[PDB]
Design a protein around this ligand. Structure first.
Ligand code: 5DQ
Ligand code: 5DQ
Lengths: 541, 541
């Protein structure tokens, strides 16, 4: 009974195999067959390549030794090499060309989802090339997905020596019989086999995946498309900034590059962006996913006025000031989308680009106060303590009833004042949505235990204030790069409401997601990530 | 009696005045005098420029209006304009060319150091140009230095209207008689004057500074060179990463750009880099100043083995992994310098560049254990509880005795075992060093109250372990960009000890600081910042 899966990197987790390039290179150059491959292996265990894989010498140190061997091995067949021949040029190109083999990673990912323990066991080098970052990026992305990564240069052992196999077993804490070993090399494969581990010779991925599926008894092939990578809160970098005495802002930080600020809606978390954080960071961005004022680890002052857009936008600018950021790409959903449109109208200097999910930008009416105005829920929210008491009564019930996809029984926003509550027609025990796990629901429950629903509800209690402030921007235009994303089945933030936006945002780029409800991020994470990344790459450098 | 100083930005805090460019442009083009200046002012209060300064319209919106006025104002003198004439081209160039007027900022900085309340009062615009970042950077850098920044476009008022002057006074909470007002415009100056505030017409800086010096009775001119900007802990972004259960790492984060990891020595803080953080962030870098394992807000496990270089380097890599960083420029001082050399030897993939202050890189001796070996202090540190008890006895006394510059009475590192203590020859009440304030000393005192000196002292108790691990790197070379910085008067980490480094680090770049003791960062902050930035710009992109 297997409980562990082990993958080689080259020719297994990453493709094309860098190894394969020696063959490609000799035949591209009209060079005698295996001359290059034999130069690589010169001296075998006492050889330059083994010293490299053992961590005795670095990659840049090894290059000259390999070139030398290329000449010594040439003497045998008496041939001469090209003038421009460069080992560095070759591996730089080979390393660069090498990518993650996605079907293989998905297979390793499924096994881990099923309680398997996974590892990467590779014969590798200490890369000190000026171009080493590319491999470092690939290595970072690969793992985060595995329980262990064992590199020969770090452990001082190589394949095929038996000590490495015994080392792998000790790390795994598994008897060989409960382990699958995947390698594209027969030699590196035998030690594991004659130790009793299950082995797969990897030639082609489908055929290798066919063998793995059969061995583990798990559907690995032709499986439906998986969800993007989520976030485990305990594994994140948590940031804390005091924007003013008694008001501190919490955020989650991941990745390097241009700053992308994520602003959630009501009643959410930085955790609403769980599917977005790894993808955008992987896309070459520095993600800062906020806990907006009143939520989670951010401060929740009792006062209503602390939640007007002018005060909220001001603190976001202070947040940038204190973080030492001249700009950030502002991305908001729901109430975050509202804030983000205001950041663009009032502070274009600090905003690289603006993106809104579901929330439309609508210019304020100078002749009518919004309080003049059945999207009844806003009226229900005005009274302090009323909506708080109902929403805080049973938190598990609150989130399960709120967080529902388009096909689920969503819950009405009309005549709620007449009904006397948001959940007055709702079951005591709501069913669990396809969007969330019980564990994910429980995160929100623990987050909302700190401050409750007062601060979040206060976001709705500044209608007249936000309206007066908005009237000042009535003559302005959004001329900075902007993206408006609509959700088909959002019945509060309807795509129709966004139709006249070009009157104020002429260069506006758009996105639309079908069969998507209000909770856009967890509804359609894959579509959201595709739209946002595409837009960031073209408009937000 | 003055207690407040107010500066205009254009022609006062920033130079050349963007205003000045209209004159430069008309005479460069052989254009009638004041044609451009008069096009700018067309309609005065009801004019396009006033609407811009009031925040009614954005900068990109205003450009077309200004071009239009340039044509209408041309009709008067009947002249024709160049084909390539561009208002955008003009202000883009003018805004870009405009810099902070350093002597003026230094003057504003001195007044604030003396208990003055300072502010910036400028007539400005909402910049939505694709090139707005430059101004946003200048604006961010300028302030951080002032109590208030009042922009006309944000407040809806302009100069010369009296409401702005009354607004400034309300923010300041000052009677006009206790305020100095500096403007390069006579018109913007009169309202403040006839309200009774002290006024300076700014033409040239020395002459304007002469007037300010006379008025406030403070030496502003020809004053000695000031210290770089320090850090106020309450104003920083604090980051927290769990690298493993029970071990969390704390850091301070400032700026955008390539990641620069700062690793302090013994017994220090992230606060040891206080002078470096703002300067490097301003230099275009993302600074991460660590609280190394055992210090401040980082975890301090009791176990000795947790402090060996192999475990410490591993956690730093995990820290990068969790932050989503493929690489970071590693900069260390003292024990941080030791760690940083090891990060390069063992993980070149994760290190963009390596920099060490005072700490030399010395290859381990395979034929001799370091424990075989009067730098007595190491021997004094081996015994658990002994050095802890002495160092923890009086924290204020510990830091004041430790943190001493070259001319101060430094304190011996020899025969300390024979003496029976580090401070056995030291006064009960040490004098306060020129390097630190009593307030800065007290920060270290509060930081060391959490974990004590055990974890930090454990860094010294892994000699044999670090030696065995180092022996594995004996055949390796540091071929990644490296900087070695020496301090003349460091008597523990002597510059002589670094002399053979090129044998292992051929491409090594160097730095040297004279009359500098062991506590390099606070000893010579200006020299340190100059060396590090220079090196980062050339070697660390
Ligand atoms: O109150 S608004 O001004 N009304 C808008 C403006 C016109 C159309 C609706 C408002 C402005 C912006 N984003 C908003 N998001 C919500 C909302 C969010 C969650 C839930 C719930 F949790 F209940 F399901 C109910 C409502 N309300 C919002
Ligand atoms: O113990 S080491 O191996 N010896 C070295 C190696 C050869 C020369 C000295 C060591 C290695 C690296 N950085 C070190 N920094 C200190 C040190 C730091 C502060 C104080 C104090 F606080 F007391 F003033 C006393 C000593 N010691 C260090």
């Amino acid at each position: 009974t297997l409980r562990a899966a082990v993958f080689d990197l080259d020719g297994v987790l990453a493709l094309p195999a860098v190894f394969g390039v020696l063959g490609r290179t000799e035949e591209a150059l009209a060079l005698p067959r295996g001359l290059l491959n034999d130069a690589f292996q010169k001296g075998g265990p006492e050889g330059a390549t083994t010293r490299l894989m053992k961590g005795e010498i670095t990659l840049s140190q090894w290059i000259p030794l390999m070139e030398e061997n290329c000449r010594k091995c040439s003497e045998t067949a008496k041939v001469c090499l090209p003038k421009n021949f460069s080992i560095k040029e070759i591996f730089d190109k080979a390393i660069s060309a090498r990518k993650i083999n996605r079907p293989m990673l998905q297979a390793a990912l499924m096994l881990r989802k099923k309680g398997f323990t996974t590892a990467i066991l590779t014969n590798t080098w200490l890369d000190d090339r000026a171009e080493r970052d590319g491999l470092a990026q690939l290595m970072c992305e690969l793992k985060m997905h595995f329980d262990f990564l064992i590199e020969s240069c770090q452990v001082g052992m190589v394949k095929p020596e038996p000590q490495i196999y015994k080392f792998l077993l000790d790390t795994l804490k598994a008897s060989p019989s409960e382990v699958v070993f995947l390698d594209d090399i027969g030699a590196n494969l035998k030690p594991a086999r004659d130790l009793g581990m299950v082995t797969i010779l990897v030639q082609d991925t489908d055929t290798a995946l066919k063998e793995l599926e059969k061995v583990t008894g798990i559907q690995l092939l032709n499986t439906p498309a998986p969800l993007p990578t989520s976030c485990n809160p305990s594994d994140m970098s948590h940031g804390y900034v005091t924007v003013k005495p008694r008001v501190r802002l919490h955020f989650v930080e991941l990745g390097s590059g241009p700053a992308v600020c994520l602003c959630h809606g009501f009643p959410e978390s930085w955790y609403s962006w769980r599917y977005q954080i790894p993808a955008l960071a992987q896309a070459g961005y520095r993600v800062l996913a906020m806990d907006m004022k009143g939520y989670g680890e951010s401060s929740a002052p009792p006062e209503i006025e602390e939640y007007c857009m002018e005060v909220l936008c001001k603190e976001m600018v202070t947040f940038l000031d204190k973080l030492g950021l001249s700009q950030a790409v502002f991305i908001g959903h729901d109430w975050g989308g509202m804030l983000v449109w205001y950041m663009a109208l009032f502070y274009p200097e600090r905003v690289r680009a603006v993106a809104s999910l579901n929330t439309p930008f609508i210019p304020a009416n100078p002749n009518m106060s919004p309080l003049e105005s059945v999207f009844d829920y806003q009226l229900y929210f005005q009274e302090p303590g009323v909506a708080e008491a109902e929403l805080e009564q049973n938190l598990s019930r609150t989130f399960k009833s709120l967080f529902r996809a388009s096909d689920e029984s969503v819950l009405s926003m009309h005549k709620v004042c007449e009904a006397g509550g948001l959940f007055v027609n709702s079951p005591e025990e709501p069913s669990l949505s396809r969007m969330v796990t019980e564990e994910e629901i429980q995160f929100y429950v623990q987050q909302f235990k700190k401050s409750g629903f007062r601060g979040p509800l206060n976001w709705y209690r500044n209608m007249e204030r936000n309206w007066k402030w908005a009237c000042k921007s009535l003559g302005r235009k959004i001329l900075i790069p902007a993206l408006m994303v609509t959700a088909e089945k959002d019945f509060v933030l309807v795509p129709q409401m966004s139709q006249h936006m070009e009157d104020w945002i002429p260069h506006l780029k758009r996105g639309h997601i079908e069969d998507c409800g209000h909770w856009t991020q967890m509804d359609k994470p894959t579509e959201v990530n595709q739209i946002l990344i595409k837009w960031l790459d073209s408009d937000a450098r």
